């Protein structure tokens with residue numbers, strides 16, 4: 001009840017939270033917000049590589065090789081830690097609220113865990129979708145076409161420019177950018 005309140009307020013006044021929704025600046029801020037959390041995981045010393053991928057279906061994904069977002073459940077509440085992070089209130093919860101769809105995949109403790117959201121509403125509980133020995137977090141989102149106008153597609157240059165800065169403002173962090181639309185790719189890292 002409290003969560004759906006905060007996500008409505010973001011949806012109601014998105015410019016407040018993400019930046020201008022009509023000129024691409026807010027659209028691309030969506031990506032940097034997701035990346036910021038992967039950066040924090042790298043600064044804690046747990047993540048060595050961040051990969052940002054522009055797909056051909058109007059989505060972007062951000063992957064890291066960190067510890068993975070926690071997957072534990074509150075016994076008496078049911079609601080998973082991952083869900084709380086994605087829904088509670090700039091932070092990913094804002095990206096989630098302004099995403100037509102968002103997919104979270106976590107590799108942690110020998111399992112792959114997945115949860116889907118639509119406009120920030122979880123479609124089902126976090127669930128096991130496989131096994132792995134890798135660890136890390138993958139967030140993929142499709143921006144709301146009710147929120148964003150004029151520039152609704154991700155632009156490589158805007159991403160490349162800010163990902164490069166992010167790598168030199170937190171040096172030792174490797175950030176790769178891949179565009180599946182045309183095969184363009186970059187690796188940003190500084191010593």
Ligand SMILES: CCNC(=O)Nc1cc2c(-c3ccncc3)ccc(Nc3cccnc3)c2cn1
Nearest residue numbers: 037038041062063064066067068069070137139
């Ligand atoms: C591709 C995006 N990557 C990412 O969010 N990495 C990440 C985030 C963690 C967070 C977090 C996420 C979003 N907003 C705020 C915080 C919290 C905790 C993590 N892991 C963790 C921390 C402490 C103990 N156990 C797991 C995260 C790991 N990777």
